[PDB]
XYZ file of C-alpha atoms in Angstrom:
293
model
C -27.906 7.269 -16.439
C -26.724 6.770 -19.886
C -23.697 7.957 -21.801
C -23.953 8.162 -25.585
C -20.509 7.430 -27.588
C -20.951 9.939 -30.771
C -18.417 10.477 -33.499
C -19.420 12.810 -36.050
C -17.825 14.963 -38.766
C -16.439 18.539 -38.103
C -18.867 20.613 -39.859
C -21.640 18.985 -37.665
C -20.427 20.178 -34.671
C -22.557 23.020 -33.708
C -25.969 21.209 -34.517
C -24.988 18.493 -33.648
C -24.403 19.871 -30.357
C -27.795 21.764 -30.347
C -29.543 18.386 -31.143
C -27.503 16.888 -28.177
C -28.408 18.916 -24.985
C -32.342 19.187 -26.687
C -32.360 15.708 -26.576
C -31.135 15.327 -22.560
C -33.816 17.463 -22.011
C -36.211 15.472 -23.950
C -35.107 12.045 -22.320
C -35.443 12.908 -18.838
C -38.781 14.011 -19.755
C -40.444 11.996 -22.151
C -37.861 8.834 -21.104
C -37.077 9.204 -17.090
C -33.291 8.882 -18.433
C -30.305 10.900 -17.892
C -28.336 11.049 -21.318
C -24.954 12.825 -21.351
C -22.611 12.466 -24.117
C -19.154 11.489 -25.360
C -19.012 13.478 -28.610
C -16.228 13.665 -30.315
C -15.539 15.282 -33.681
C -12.973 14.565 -36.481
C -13.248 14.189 -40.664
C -15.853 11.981 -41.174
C -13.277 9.219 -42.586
C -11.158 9.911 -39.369
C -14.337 9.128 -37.562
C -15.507 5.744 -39.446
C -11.999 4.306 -38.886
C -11.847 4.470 -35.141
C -14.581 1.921 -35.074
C -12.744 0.213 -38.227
C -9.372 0.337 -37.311
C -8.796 1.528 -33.970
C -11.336 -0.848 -32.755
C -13.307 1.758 -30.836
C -16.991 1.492 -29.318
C -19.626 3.763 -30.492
C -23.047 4.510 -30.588
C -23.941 6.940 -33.540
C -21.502 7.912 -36.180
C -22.839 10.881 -38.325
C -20.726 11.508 -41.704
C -20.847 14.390 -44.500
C -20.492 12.109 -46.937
C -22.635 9.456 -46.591
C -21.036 6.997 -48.914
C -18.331 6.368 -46.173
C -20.877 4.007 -44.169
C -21.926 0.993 -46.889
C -18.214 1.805 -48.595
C -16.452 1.108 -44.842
C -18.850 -0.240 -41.910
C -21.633 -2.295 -43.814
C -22.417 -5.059 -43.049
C -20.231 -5.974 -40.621
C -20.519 -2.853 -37.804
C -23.869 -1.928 -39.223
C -26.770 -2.509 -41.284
C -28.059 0.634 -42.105
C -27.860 4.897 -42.372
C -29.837 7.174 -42.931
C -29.467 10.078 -45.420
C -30.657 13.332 -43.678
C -28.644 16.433 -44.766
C -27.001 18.608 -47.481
C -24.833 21.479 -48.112
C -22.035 22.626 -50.625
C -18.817 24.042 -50.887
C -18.083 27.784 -51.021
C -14.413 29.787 -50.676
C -14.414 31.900 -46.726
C -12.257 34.818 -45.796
C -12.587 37.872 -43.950
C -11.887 41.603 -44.188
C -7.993 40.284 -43.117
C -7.944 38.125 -46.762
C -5.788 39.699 -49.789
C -7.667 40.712 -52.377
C -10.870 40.590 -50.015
C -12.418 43.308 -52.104
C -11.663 41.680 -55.927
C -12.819 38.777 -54.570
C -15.967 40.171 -53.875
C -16.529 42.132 -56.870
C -15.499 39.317 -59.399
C -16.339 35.859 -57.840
C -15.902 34.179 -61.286
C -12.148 34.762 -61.114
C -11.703 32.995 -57.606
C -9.380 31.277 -59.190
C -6.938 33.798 -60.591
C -6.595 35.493 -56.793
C -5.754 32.238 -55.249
C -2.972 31.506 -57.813
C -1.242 34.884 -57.462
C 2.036 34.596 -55.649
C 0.993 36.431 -52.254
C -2.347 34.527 -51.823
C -2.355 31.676 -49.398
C -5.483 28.977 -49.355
C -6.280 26.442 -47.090
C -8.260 23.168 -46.981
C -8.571 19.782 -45.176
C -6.696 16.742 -45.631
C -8.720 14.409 -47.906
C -7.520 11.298 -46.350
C -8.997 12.321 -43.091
C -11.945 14.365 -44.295
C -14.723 15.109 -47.034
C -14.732 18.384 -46.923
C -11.208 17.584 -47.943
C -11.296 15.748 -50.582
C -14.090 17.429 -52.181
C -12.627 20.397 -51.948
C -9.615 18.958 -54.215
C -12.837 17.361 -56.330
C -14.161 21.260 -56.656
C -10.874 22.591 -58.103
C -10.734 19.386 -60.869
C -14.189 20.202 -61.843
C -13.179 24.053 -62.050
C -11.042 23.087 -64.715
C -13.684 21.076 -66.723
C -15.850 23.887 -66.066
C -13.903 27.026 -67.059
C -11.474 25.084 -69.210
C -8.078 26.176 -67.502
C -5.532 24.358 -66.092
C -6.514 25.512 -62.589
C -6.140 22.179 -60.776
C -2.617 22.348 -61.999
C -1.617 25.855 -61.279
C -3.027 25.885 -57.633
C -2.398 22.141 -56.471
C -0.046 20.167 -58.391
C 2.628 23.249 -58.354
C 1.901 23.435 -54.702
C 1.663 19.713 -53.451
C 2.456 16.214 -53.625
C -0.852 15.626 -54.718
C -1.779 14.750 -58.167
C -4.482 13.741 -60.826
C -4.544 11.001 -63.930
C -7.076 12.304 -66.317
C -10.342 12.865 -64.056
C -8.656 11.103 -61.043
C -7.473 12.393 -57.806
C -4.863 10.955 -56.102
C -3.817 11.826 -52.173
C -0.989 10.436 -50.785
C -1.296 9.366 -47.891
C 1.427 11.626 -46.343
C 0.805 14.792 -48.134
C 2.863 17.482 -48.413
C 2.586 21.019 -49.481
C 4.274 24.448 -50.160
C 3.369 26.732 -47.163
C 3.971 29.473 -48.957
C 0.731 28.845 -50.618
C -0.818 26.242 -48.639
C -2.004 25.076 -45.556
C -3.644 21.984 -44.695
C -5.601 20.559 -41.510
C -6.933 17.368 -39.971
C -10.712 18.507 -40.673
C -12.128 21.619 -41.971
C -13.308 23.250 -38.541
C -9.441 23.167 -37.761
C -8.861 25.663 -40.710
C -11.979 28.584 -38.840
C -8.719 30.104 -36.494
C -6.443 30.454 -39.498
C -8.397 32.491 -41.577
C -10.235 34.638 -38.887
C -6.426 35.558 -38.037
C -5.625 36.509 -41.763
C -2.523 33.808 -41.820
C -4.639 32.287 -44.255
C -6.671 34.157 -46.768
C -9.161 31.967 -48.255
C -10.663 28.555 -47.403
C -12.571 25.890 -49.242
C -15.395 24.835 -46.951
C -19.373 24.484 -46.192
C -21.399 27.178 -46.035
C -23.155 26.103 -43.533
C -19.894 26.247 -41.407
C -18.993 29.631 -43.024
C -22.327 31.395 -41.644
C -22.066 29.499 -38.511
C -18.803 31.572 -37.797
C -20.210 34.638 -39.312
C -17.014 34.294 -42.348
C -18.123 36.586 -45.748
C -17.809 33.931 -48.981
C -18.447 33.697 -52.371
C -20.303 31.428 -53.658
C -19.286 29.040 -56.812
C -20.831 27.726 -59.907
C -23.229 24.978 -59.589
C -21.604 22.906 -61.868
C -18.450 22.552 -59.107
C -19.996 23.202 -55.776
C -21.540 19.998 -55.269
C -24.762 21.864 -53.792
C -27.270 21.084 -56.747
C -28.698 17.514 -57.553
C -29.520 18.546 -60.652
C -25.541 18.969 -61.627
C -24.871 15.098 -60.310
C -23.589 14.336 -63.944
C -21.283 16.991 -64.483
C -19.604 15.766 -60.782
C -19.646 12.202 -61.759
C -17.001 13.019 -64.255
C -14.218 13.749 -61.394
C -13.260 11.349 -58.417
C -10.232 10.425 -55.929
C -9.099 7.783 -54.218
C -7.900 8.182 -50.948
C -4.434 7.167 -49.141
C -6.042 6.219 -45.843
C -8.738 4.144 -47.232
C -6.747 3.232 -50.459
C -11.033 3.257 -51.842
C -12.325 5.650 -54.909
C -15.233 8.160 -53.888
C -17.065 9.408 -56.849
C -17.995 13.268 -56.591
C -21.403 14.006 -56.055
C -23.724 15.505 -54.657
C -23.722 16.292 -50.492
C -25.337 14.181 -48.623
C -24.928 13.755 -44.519
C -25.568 10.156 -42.927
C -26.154 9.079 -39.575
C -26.421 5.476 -38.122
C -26.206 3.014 -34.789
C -23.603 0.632 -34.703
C -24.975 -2.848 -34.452
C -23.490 -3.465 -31.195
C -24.088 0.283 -30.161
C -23.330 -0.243 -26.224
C -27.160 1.741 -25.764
C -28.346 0.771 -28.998
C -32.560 1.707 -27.666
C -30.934 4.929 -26.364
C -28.937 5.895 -28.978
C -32.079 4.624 -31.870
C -34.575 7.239 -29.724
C -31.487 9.952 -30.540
C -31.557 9.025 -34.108
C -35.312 9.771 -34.595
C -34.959 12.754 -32.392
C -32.233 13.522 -34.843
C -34.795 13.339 -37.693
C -37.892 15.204 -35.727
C -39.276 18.351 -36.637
C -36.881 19.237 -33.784
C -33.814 18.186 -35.210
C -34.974 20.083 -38.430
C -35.828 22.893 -36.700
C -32.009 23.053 -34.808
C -30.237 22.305 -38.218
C -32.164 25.590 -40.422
C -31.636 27.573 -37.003
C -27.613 26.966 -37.514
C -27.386 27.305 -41.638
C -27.857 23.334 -42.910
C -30.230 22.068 -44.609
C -31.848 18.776 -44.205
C -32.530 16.429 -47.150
């Protein structure tokens, strides 16, 4: 009987555990094993630093931005990852959102709705989590992009968070106006808010937004960080984060996955990995919205 120690970010919580109870299946019988699992999600930086800070055990940590693992846990937790998924950012809501309809009809002026004075937005601390931060990164490229001050008008009026020429800055206590704001641990936390209508539009994945069957618009390629081929235009905005105190450039999303070194079921949690990367694991990810790489 084995136990598998998994931290993972938010948004791969539902494949993630699809892939899971596949794979119990698969090891009793292709591996006369029992495999259950300690999963735990959290932002993918949240996740990375309870091995690097906490001092926590693990097997498999899975990130949505795979840069965390050389940037924080190579070489000395690990010696590897392996880059296996995509996505990009859209903006959810719901027939409860203000302006639902407007929104609809003109996507191209998303940002004009969320900067009128009724309109409240949501998205996840960047400290804690990339869908976080690059949601920040999103907004700084809209300005490039359009060539408005909208990184201004919608988070520097509304936070303590700021931006020197094409850098981001979080603190790492942020603060915000909850009039217009509201911010979460990790994107998944932000699903309740807006399905309630407190909250009436949120920056995050679209393969999280049509895993909780949420309408969204989608954005330019330029800023959604969806489309390899727009990897220079992204280069030109990045942020450094309180938590870490390290720079992360934006670009384009990529998930990665590795085993810890000293993984306490390091053959175990290696046959989970490739199971991870099967046909299967494919197959589970498409079923639930996400594409692999």
């Amino acid at each position: 009987e084995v136990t598998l120690i998994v931290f993972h970010a938010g948004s791969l919580s539902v494949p993630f555990q699809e892939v899971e109870k596949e794979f119990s299946e698969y090891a009793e019988r292709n591996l006369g094993i029992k495999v259950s699992f300690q999963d735990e999600a959290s932002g993918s930086v949240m996740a990375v630093r309870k091995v690097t800070d906490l001092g926590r055990k693990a097997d498999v940590i899975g990130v949505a931005d795979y840069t965390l693992i050389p940037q924080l846990l190579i070489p000395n937790y690990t010696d590897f990852y392996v880059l296996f998924a995509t996505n990009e950012i859209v903006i959810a809501f719901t027939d409860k959102s203000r302006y639902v309809e407007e929104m609809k009809s003109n996507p191209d002026k998303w940002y004009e709705i969320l900067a009128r004075e009724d309109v409240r937005f949501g998205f996840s601390d960047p400290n804690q989590d990339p869908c976080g931060y690059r949601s920040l990164m999103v907004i700084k490229l809209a300005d490039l992009y359009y060539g408005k001050e909208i990184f201004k008008e919608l988070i520097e009026e509304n936070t303590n968070i700021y931006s020197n020429g094409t850098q981001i800055y979080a603190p790492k206590e942020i603060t915000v106006n909850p009039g217009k704001i509201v911010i979460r641990p990790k994107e998944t936390d932000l699903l309740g808010l807006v399905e309630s209508g407190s909250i009436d539009y949120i920056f995050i994945y679209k393969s999280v937004a049509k895993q909780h069957n949420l309408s969204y618009i989608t954005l330019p390629s330029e800023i959604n960080l969806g489309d390899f081929s727009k990897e220079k235009f992204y280069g030109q905005i990045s942020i450094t984060l309180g938590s870490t105190g390290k720079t992360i450039k934006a670009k384009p999303i990529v998930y990665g996955v590795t085993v810890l070194k000293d993984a306490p079921n390091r053959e175990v949690a290696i046959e989970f990995l490739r199971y991870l990367l099967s046909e299967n694991g494919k197959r589970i990810f498409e079923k639930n919205h996400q594409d692999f790489l």
